[PDB]
Amino acid sequence: DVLVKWSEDLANLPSIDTQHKRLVDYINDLYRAARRRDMDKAREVFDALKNYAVEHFGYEERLFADYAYPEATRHKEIHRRFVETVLKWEKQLAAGDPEVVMTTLRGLVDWLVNHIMKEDKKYEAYLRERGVS
Secondary structure: OOOOOOOHHHOOOHHHHHHHHHHHHHHHHHHHHHHOOOHHHHHHHHHHHHHHHHHHHHHHHHHHHHHOOOOHHHHHHHHHHHHHHHHHHHHHHHHOOHHHHHHHHHHHHHHHHHHHHHHHHHHHHHHHHOOOO
């Protein structure tokens, strides 16, 4: 059905969950397109994923600034570094085929799931206390 199922340990603030769920959905759409050997669709999905990640990082960072999250600086750098990675992957998909998409999923899933589980989880308690959700 899907490559990445939504497990309960990924849970965070309600609003944050709506965006993280979108990212996971994009990953699954990307996998399905690659599995179908539909490269045109794969590139379109990756494009949407790319755009959404950039927007999502902005959303989190806005909250960090608004409520003075202590680890905002380190977290922002982590986001920026991933955007660089995504832009590199974009070029590889532009020149490659579905096999390249699958290979890319290895690093894409590893980074996203780990980021949500480790780095993003660190701001939940802090933000909740400040009236965020």
